[PDB]
C-alpha cells in the first residue's frame, strides 16, 4: 500500500490520548485500520488509527516521545501486513509503577482485576516492545512499560493443544484471550498480588 505524505499534528484530546490511537480525519482513513509510519529509512513504527485536518495525523505526546515525532514533520504513512494467525499475543510482560510518586502506598492491590480490565479496555489494539502507557485502578494512576511479547502458538488459533513453541514477536495484537504480567521496577512500594498478575520465581542468590 502506497505511502501518503502527511503532516504531524497534536492529538486533539486527552481522551484520545488514553486510547493509544493515532487520530486521523475520516476522509483519510477509517477507524481500526493499521499504518506503518516511516520516520527514516531505518525507523518504522506500527500504529492503530473529525477535528483532525485531512492530510494530517495527530499524535499524542507519549506516541511522539516513543517514536520521536515532531509536530509538522512530513511523514510517509503506509500499512503493515499484520500477519493473521501468529502475532496476536499469548502473554506479555510489562513493568509497572505509580504514575506519580505522590500517590504511593504499600498495601496490596488485588490485580487480576487490573489485568482483566486491561484486556477489556485495550482489546484488539496493536502493542509493541518498549512502548510506554498509563493505566488506572482504585482511582490511582500507574505508568507501564512493555518488556516482552510471546505470541500464541498458532495451534491454539487452530483449536489444537499448544506445543509450547511460543514465538517472540516484534509486534503483537491483543485479542480476547491474551494475558499480561506486571513486574515491578525495583524501587517501589506498590504491593501487588491478584494471583495471575504473574511474578516469575525470583531465582536470586542470598548470602547467610
Amino acid at each position: 500500500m502506497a505511502g501518503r505524505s502527511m503532516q504531524a499534528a497534536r492529538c486533539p484530546t486527552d481522551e484520545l490520548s488514553l486510547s493509544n490511537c493515532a487520530v486521523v480525519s475520516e476522509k483519510d482513513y477509517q477507524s481500526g485500520q493499521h499504518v506503518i509510519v516511516r520516520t527514516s529509512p531505518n525507523h518504522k513504527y506500527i500504529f492503530t488509527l473529525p477535528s483532525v485536518v485531512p492530510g494530517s495525523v495527530a499524535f499524542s505526546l507519549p506516541q511522539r516521545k516513543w517514536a520521536g515525532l515532531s509536530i509538522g514533520q512530513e511523514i510517509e504513512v503506509a500499512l503493515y501486513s499484520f500477519d493473521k494467525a501468529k502475532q496476536c499475543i499469548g502473554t506479555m510482560t510489562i513493568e509497572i509503577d505509580f504514575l506519580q510518586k505522590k500517590n504511593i502506598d504499600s498495601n496490596p492491590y488485588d490485580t487480576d482485576k487490573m489485568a482483566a480490565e486491561f484486556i477489556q479496555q485495550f482489546n484488539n489494539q496493536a502493542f509493541s516492545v518498549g512502548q510506554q502507557l498509563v493505566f488506572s485502578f482504585n482511582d490511582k494512576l500507574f505508568g507501564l512499560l512493555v518488556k516482552d511479547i510471546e505470541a500464541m502458538d498458532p495451534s491454539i488459533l487452530k483449536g489444537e493443544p499448544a506445543s509450547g513453541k511460543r514465538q517472540k514477536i516484534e509486534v503483537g495484537l491483543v485479542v480476547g484471550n491474551s494475558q499480561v504480567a506486571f513486574e515491578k521496577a525495583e524501587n517501589s512500594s506498590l504491593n501487588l498480588i491478584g494471583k495471575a498478575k504473574t511474578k516469575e520465581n525470583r531465582q536470586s542468590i542470598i548470602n547467610p
Binding site: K195, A196, T198, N201, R202, Q203, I206
Partner: protein, 213 residues
C-alpha cells in the same frame, strides 16, 4: 505373546516375584472372589539402588508386560514453569482422563499406568527446601492431594526412581502411596552369565565368536 524370557531381564528373580506377588495378585483373580475378600489394590512403586543397574529397563519392561493405555511418562522436571500455578495445571491435566474414564465406567474400568522419572527433582521435603520457592511445596501438597485426597482413584499405578533415597519426603512414603520400597543390588555369577549370554546371543547365532572363549 508375553513370556519371561522375552523381557531379557537378568538375575532379578526374587525381586520380580515379590513385585508380581505384592502388586498384581488381585487383578488376576476373577472379580467375584476378589470382591468377596473386599481388598484394595496397590497404586505405587519405589525402586532405588546404586547407579547403573537397570531400573528404567525394569520399568519399561513392566510397561510392555501390561496391556493397558500407553503409560504417561513425566521425564524429570518438565513440569516446572515460570508462570504462577501453571505446573499445577499440568499435574491435574494428567489425572483428568483417568478420572473421566472411571466416572464413565465405574468399578469395571481399565487401568492407567503413570511413570515418573527422576522423582527426586520434583518431590523433596516441603519443610527442608529453599524458602524462596514455595512452588515445590505446593506441587508436593497438590500431588499428595491428587494421588490420595478425600476422593479415591483406583485405576492408576505410579512409578518413581531416584539415586539418593534419603532426600525423599517422609509424607509420601506411607501406606497407600508407596509402601513397597525395593532395593536393587549387584548380581551374582549366574546373573552375569545370563547377561553375557543375552549380549552374546547374536554373536553365537551369526558365528562371530571363537570357540576358545
Amino acid at each position: 505373546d508375553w513370556n519371561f524370557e522375552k523381557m531379557g531381564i537378568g538375575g532379578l528373580d526374587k525381586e520380580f516375584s515379590d513385585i508380581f506377588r505384592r502388586a498384581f495378585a488381585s487383578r488376576v483373580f476373577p472379580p467375584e472372589i476378589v470382591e468377596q475378600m473386599g481388598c484394595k489394590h496397590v497404586k505405587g512403586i519405589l525402586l532405588y539402588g546404586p547407579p547403573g543397574c537397570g531400573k528404567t529397563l525394569l520399568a519399561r519392561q513392566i510397561g510392555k508386560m501390561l496391556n493397558a493405555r500407553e503409560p504417561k511418562v513425566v521425564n524429570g522436571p518438565e513440569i516446572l514453569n515460570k508462570y504462577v500455578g501453571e505446573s499445577e495445571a499440568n499435574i491435574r491435566k494428567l489425572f483428568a482422563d483417568a478420572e473421566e474414564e472411571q466416572r464413565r465406567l465405574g468399578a469395571n474400568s481399565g487401568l492407567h499406568i503413570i511413570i515418573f522419572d527422576e522423582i527426586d527433582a520434583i518431590c523433596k521435603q516441603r519443610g527442608s527446601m529453599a524458602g524462596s520457592t514455595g512452588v515445590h511445596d505446593t506441587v508436593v501438597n497438590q500431588l499428595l492431594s491428587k494421588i490420595d485426597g478425600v476422593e479415591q482413584l483406583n485405576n492408576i499405578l505410579v512409578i518413581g526412581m531416584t539415586n539418593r533415597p534419603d532426600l525423599i519426603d517422609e509424607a509420601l512414603l506411607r501406606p497407600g502411596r508407596l509402601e513397597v520400597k525395593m532395593e536393587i543390588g549387584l548380581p551374582d555369577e549366574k546373573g552375569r552369565l545370563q547377561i553375557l549370554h543375552i549380549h552374546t546371543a547374536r554373536m553365537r547365532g551369526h558365528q562371530l565368536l571363537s570357540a576358545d572363549v
